[PDB]
Write a protein that binds this ligand. Structure first.
Ligand SMILES: [K+]
Ligand SMILES: [Mg+2]
Ligand SMILES: [Mg+2]
Length: 148
RNA sequence: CGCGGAUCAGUCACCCAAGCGCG
């Protein structure tokens, strides 16, 4: 199957619950999706964040699924960040997500009901309700896929 | 590459050190 990458920012309070005791949860998730998942270590934050990074590699569907799981776990806090997803895209993909004078991010936001913003990489922050975020991430991933 | 799993890690896995191998 065709393999793709997704980098997601995880607040440190959520990492415990996505790895699980002795790694059980992350293993299961990797085994069930076929995805490979790597978190940066506890104090390895994305430049100018307090967030760890989660490298996911797998099929388009596995990326949406892994990210769906991560979102859920983040939604169970120890305020703004409860309902955001941040992902890291190459400048190339960043360019594709925006679109001619912002047409594309506007289309995405219409289709999702999410509020999407962009900060050699940029972080994309998606804002809204679970199903809204999940929808926008699907469109974003689709544009990760389509960039050669 | 395989076994291993120091130290880190506080739901902490994978990766990574010693050490011991197979090719
Ligand atoms: K090993
Ligand atoms: Mg091992
Ligand atoms: Mg080794």
């Amino acid at each position: 199957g065709s393999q793709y990458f997704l980098k997601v920012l995880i607040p440190s309070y959520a990492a415990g619950s996505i790895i699980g005791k002795g790694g059980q949860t992350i293993v299961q998730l990797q085994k069930e999706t076929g995805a490979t998942i790597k978190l940066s270590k506890s104090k390895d934050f994305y430049p100018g964040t307090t967030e760890r990074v989660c490298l996911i590699q797998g099929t388009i569907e596995a990326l949406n699924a892994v990210h769906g799981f991560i979102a859920e776990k983040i939604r169970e806090m120890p305020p703004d960040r409860a309902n955001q997803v941040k992902i890291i895209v190459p400048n190339s993909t960043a360019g594709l997500i925006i679109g001619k004078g912002g047409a594309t991010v506007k289309a995405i936001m219409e289709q999702s009901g999410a509020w999407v913003q962009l900060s050699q990489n940029r972080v994309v922050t998606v804002s809204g309700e679970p199903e809204q975020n999940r929808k926008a991430v699907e469109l974003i991933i689709q544009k990760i896929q389509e960039d050669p």
